[PDB]
Amino acid sequence: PFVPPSWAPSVFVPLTGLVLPAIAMATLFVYIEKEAP
Amino acid sequence: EVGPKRGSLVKILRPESYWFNQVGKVVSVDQSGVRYPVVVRFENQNYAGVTTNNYALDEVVAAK
Amino acid sequence: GMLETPVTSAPIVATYLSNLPAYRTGVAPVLRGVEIGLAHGFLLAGPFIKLGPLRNVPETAEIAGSLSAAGLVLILALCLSIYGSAQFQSARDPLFSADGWSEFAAGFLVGGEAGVAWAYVCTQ
Amino acid sequence: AHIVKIYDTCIGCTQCVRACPLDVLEMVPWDGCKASQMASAPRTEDCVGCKRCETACPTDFLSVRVYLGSESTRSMGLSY
Amino acid sequence: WTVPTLNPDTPSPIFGGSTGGLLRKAQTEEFYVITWEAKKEQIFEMPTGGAAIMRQGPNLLKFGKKEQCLALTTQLRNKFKLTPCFYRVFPDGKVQYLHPADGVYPEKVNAGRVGANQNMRRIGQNVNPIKVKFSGRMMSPAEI
Amino acid sequence: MKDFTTYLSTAPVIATIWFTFTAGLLIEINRYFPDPLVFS
Amino acid sequence: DIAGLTPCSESKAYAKLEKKELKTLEKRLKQYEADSAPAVALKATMERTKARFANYAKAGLLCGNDGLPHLIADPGLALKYGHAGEVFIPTFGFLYVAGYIGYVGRQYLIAVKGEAKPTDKEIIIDVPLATKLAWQGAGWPLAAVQELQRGTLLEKEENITVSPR
Amino acid sequence: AKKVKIAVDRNPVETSFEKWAKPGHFSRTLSKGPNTTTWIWNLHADAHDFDSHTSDLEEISRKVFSA
Ligand code: CLA
Ligand code: CLA
Ligand code: CLA
Ligand code: SF4
Ligand code: SF4
Structure with a gap:
């Protein structure tokens, strides 16, 4: 029941190494630059 | 008539002074009621190269 | 004032820059985005195809290189978009505004990907 | 902006005012020393x-004591 | 003594120009203007680099930050024995005058000045940092 | 001659003579008593 | 013996070490003449090598499995088994010289503090005074102790400057 | 049209060991003697900085030539 599929690394490695960092950097860059009301 | 005699040796009691617990020679004592009338000269300079400083009456005591 | 120099102040140089899409005012920001995106997108495919990890494969080299050029254009489009968000939060040219830059970034994505696709068609 | 404080041991030599490269300090009348003048820090917003x-x-x-504090274009000494 | 008014049409020294001049800050935040009278045409050193010739009579220069203006003021006073004064100019057109704030250079004591940031104690009589803790912000014992 | 002997009394000159003497004594002792490891 | 060590005179590895060093010297010797300058120098080295290994064995040192002398530092073990000359005796040899040097320097420093310009007496040494103090330092342990008992060795706490606390 | 010629001054300086016994003689600042160990380093650092000992170009040149 626990064993993940044999293709899990193919999806999660690019996802956590290329995709989430891109969204995280965009989120952080916008946040720090945001001006107070 | 106020302060130690000119040329006498006094011991400094200002904790923030470079010469705390050290002996210096009195150069002059102002009689105008200023905050720090006593002028003392030292034979060893401080970190800025100065060898003289002004002290209040209660910050200086006679040698011993 | 500033140190005058032919490079900084020359007639021939000034005219050339004034005709570039970036400096050509009077054009909608979206259209300027497409014009700029196409030029960079077309060039971006070159180095990936010739020097990529799959460069020596006969037919896969063209596809892999162009597909990586398309990816880089997508990343650049994100950079353009977030730059507008940070820079323009509150003047003569419409481009340098929150509304203008958002259109500019969208045009770059459309033009850039079209240029990458157009470059691929040239090969095959 | 930095914080600059003048303490009552000033002898009114004026050397601090001459040294300052941004005209932050100035001398004002006083009765607490032989020179009858004391240093002042009216323009600390220009202090670097x-x-x-x-x-x-x-x-x-x-x-005279300087306590570095919040930074700004003026206190960071920027010309851009 | 009254606050001088800046004259934007004042002639400027004979200077070719350099890359050490004003930047985009002058157009968005502020810049500084220094003016003085010259007895005779002479060569002086620009704080931004290079040499300039001051015209006889009024002269005017623009600098990017205050320290540059007061650096030139020191040179003019010490060597050429002149009496320059400089302003702060904002992009909106407002002009603020300073140095000399009251017309007399700060090194010389003048009546009418009000002491600022003067503590009537020694450095050694400040309170301990614990006694100024949780005061809403990082505060030194010297501030209180 | 008084000034010259004063020059020889300066710190660098004294140290050179003193260490030259000190080193020479140690070198000579090890020349006549080679390889000392234990007082014995 | 002590700590599992054995006397170097009875150590097999110690004896083998001497042969190795002499063999190395002999190998270089046979490429020269009988009484040439290089040959004489090499023979002199071999004599010192043989003397050194005899002296250490004669001194009754202890050798480990490495076949090299080891020294005993505990005073009780040293005096118990006659190893006082390794560390114990040299300990009091050094302290006498170290105290001699330090005591002589302290005497000179006190002597010039009374002069008008002490600083000029430090860069420019007063050689006649220094030689006088150099000889009188031989009795420093006696003089040092008497100062301690009379209470003039240390300054008063009230005459020493200290930072705010 | 200044002619090219040999030009010297006779006995400009006296040969004495007096100044060998007065470290720092070359500089006004160090001539007073030491008060802190910083003086010792300043003596060696500025020994050959002739241009700062005197403002006379002729005196500077003569030291360079003999050094
Ligand atoms: C975990 C992080 C990570 C991952 C997963 C990758 C993955 C990859 N890297 Mg590496 N790289 C990384 C971090 C990473 N890198 C970092 C941190 C650096 C800097 C030190 C580099 C520097 C680097 C270089 C310099 C190169 C690579 C390359 C590669 C490729 C090698 C395999 C190959 O033959 O691809 C072949 C690739 C393809 C056949 C195409 C794959 C898909 C493309 C790239 C994107 C497609 C996008 C799609 C069309 C539209 C968007 C979809 C999206 C929204 C879901 C592969 C795509 C090589 C390459 O070929 O890059 C292009 C290459 O030259 N990387
Ligand atoms: C600067 C150093 C350098 C260089 C020249 C290269 C070069 C290369 N690397 Mg390597 N690499 C480097 C450092 C470098 N690498 C480092 C430090 C690492 C460790 C992190 C790696 C890790 C790495 C990996 C993992 C891989 C490579 C690969 C490659 C190849 C393809 C790269 C690619 O797709 O670029 C794409 C190129 C561009 C998008 C453009 C490049 C810049 C252009 C040409 C500038 C042109 C400017 C122009 C002249 C200006 C004109 C102005 C005018 C109009 C006014 C290529 C041979 C890949 C391969 O397969 O190699 C065989 C691969 O898989 N590299
Ligand atoms: C640096 C600390 C230190 C240490 C760890 C040791 C350790 C040792 N010493 Mg040594 N010793 C030292 C310093 C030290 N000593 C000093 C400074 C002196 C005075 C100069 C001595 C004088 C001395 C003597 C006279 C003797 C030892 C002995 C010993 C051994 C057993 C007793 C002992 O001292 O127990 C642990 C150590 C301590 C708690 C510190 C104080 C030790 C005192 C000074 C000596 C105790 C001797 C003991 C009563 C002997 C009883 C008979 C024994 C066979 C059981 C042990 C290897 C004995 C020995 O040779 O055993 C084989 C022995 O007879 N030591
Ligand atoms: S604070 Fe200024 S005026 Fe007061 S003593 Fe110091 S240098 Fe002189
Ligand atoms: S720290 Fe501030 S007050 Fe002191 S000299 Fe610098 S700018 Fe002037």
Whole structure:
């Protein structure tokens, strides 16, 4: 029941190494630059 | 008539002074009621190269 | 004032820059985005195809290189978009505004990907 | 903006005012010293924190003190 | 003594120009203007680099930050024995005058000045940092 | 001659003579008593 | 013996070490003449090598499995088994010289503090005074102790400057 | 049209060991003697900085030539 599929690394490695960092950097860059009301 | 005699040796009691617990020679004592009338000269300079400083009456005591 | 120099102040140089899409005012920001995106997108495919990890494969080299050029254009489009968000939060040219830059970034994505696709068609 | 404080051990030598490269300090009348003048810091918003004033003060310990604080275009000494 | 009014049409020294001049800050935040009278045409050193010739009579220069203006003021006073004064100019057109704030250079004591940031105690009589803790912000014992 | 002997009394000159003497004594002792490891 | 060590005179590895060093010297010797300058120098080295290994064995040192002398530092073990000359005796040899040097320097420093310009007496040494103090330092342990008992060795706490606390 | 010629001054300086016994003689600042160990380093650092000992170009040149 626990064993993940044999293709899990193919999806999660690019996802956590290329995709989430891109969204995280965009989120952080916008946040720090945001001006107070 | 106020302060130690000119040329006498006094011991400094200002904790923030470079010469705390050290002996210096009195150069002059102002009689105008200023905050720090006593002028003392030292034979060893401080970190800025100065060898003289002004002290209040209660910050200086006679040698011993 | 500033140190005058032919490079900084020359007639021939000034005219050339004034005709570039970036400096050509009077054009909608979206259209300027497409014009700029196409030029960079077309060039971006070159180095990936010739020097990529799959460069020596006969037919896969063209596809892999162009597909990586398309990816880089997508990343650049994100950079353009977030730059507008940070820079323009509150003047003569419409481009340098929150509304203008958002259109500019969208045009770059459309033009850039079209240029990458157009470059691929040239090969095959 | 930095914080600059003048303490009552000032002897009114004026060396801090001359040393300051941004005209932050000035001399004002006083009755607490022989020179009858004291240093003042009316324009600390222009202070950059060089501490040239502290280098120039003869009194021991210093009579002028600079406490580096919040940064800004002026205090960070930027021309851009 | 009254606050001088800046004259934007004042002639400027004979200077070729350099890359050490004003930047985009002058157009968005502020810049500084220094003016003085010259007895005779002479060569002086620009704080931004290079040499300039001052015209006889009024002269005017623009600098990017205050320290540059007061650096030139020191040179003019010490060597040429002149009496320059400089302003702060904002992009909106407002002009603020300073140095000399009251017309007399700060090194010389003048009546009418009000002491600022003067503590009537020694450095050694400040309170301990614990006694100024949780005061809403990082505060030194010297501030209180 | 008084000034010259004063020059020889300066710190660098004294140290050179003193260490030259000190080194020479140690070198000579090890020349006549080679390889000392234990007082014995 | 002590700590599992054995006397170097009875150590097999110690004896083998001497042969190795002499063999190395002999190998270089046979490429020269009988009484040439290089040959004489090499023979002199071999004599010192043989003397050194005899002296250490004669001194009754202890050798480990490495076949090299080891020294005993505990005073009780040293005096118990006659190893006082390794560390114990040299300990009091050094302290006498170290105290001699330090005591002589302290005497000179006190002597010039009374002069008008002490600083000029430090860069420019007063050689006649220094030689006088150099000889009188031989009795420093006696003089040092008497100062301690009379209470003039240390300054008063009230005459020493300290930082705010 | 200044002619090219040999030009010297006779006995400009006296040969004595007096100044060998007065460290720092070359500089006004160090001539007073030491008060802190910083003086010792300043003596060696500024020994050959002729241009700062005197403002006379002729005196500087003569030291360079003999050094
Ligand atoms: C975990 C992080 C990570 C991952 C997963 C990758 C993955 C990859 N890297 Mg590496 N790289 C990384 C971090 C990473 N890198 C970092 C941190 C650096 C800097 C030190 C580099 C520097 C680097 C270089 C310099 C190169 C690579 C290359 C590669 C490729 C090698 C395999 C190959 O033959 O691809 C072949 C690739 C393809 C056949 C195409 C794959 C898909 C493309 C790239 C994107 C497609 C996008 C799609 C069309 C539209 C968007 C979809 C999206 C929204 C879901 C592969 C795509 C090589 C390459 O070929 O890059 C292009 C290459 O030259 N990387
Ligand atoms: C600067 C150093 C350098 C260089 C020249 C290269 C070069 C290369 N690397 Mg390597 N690499 C480097 C450092 C470098 N690498 C480092 C430090 C690492 C460790 C992190 C790696 C890790 C790495 C990996 C993992 C891989 C490579 C690969 C490659 C190849 C393809 C790269 C690619 O797709 O670029 C794409 C190129 C561009 C998008 C453009 C490049 C810049 C252009 C040409 C500038 C042109 C400017 C122009 C002249 C200006 C004109 C102005 C005018 C109009 C006014 C290529 C041979 C890949 C391969 O397969 O190699 C065989 C691969 O898989 N590299
Ligand atoms: C640096 C600390 C230190 C240490 C760890 C040791 C350790 C040792 N010493 Mg040594 N010793 C030292 C310093 C030290 N000593 C000093 C400074 C002196 C005075 C100069 C001595 C004088 C001395 C003597 C006279 C003797 C030892 C002995 C010993 C051994 C057993 C007793 C002992 O001292 O127990 C642990 C150590 C301590 C708690 C510190 C104080 C030790 C005192 C000074 C000596 C105790 C001797 C003991 C009563 C002997 C009883 C008979 C024994 C066979 C059981 C042990 C290897 C004995 C020995 O040779 O055993 C084989 C022995 O007879 N030591
Ligand atoms: S703060 Fe120091 S330098 Fe300034 S006037 Fe007072 S004593 Fe003089
Ligand atoms: S720190 Fe610098 S700018 Fe500030 S008052 Fe002191 S000298 Fe002037």
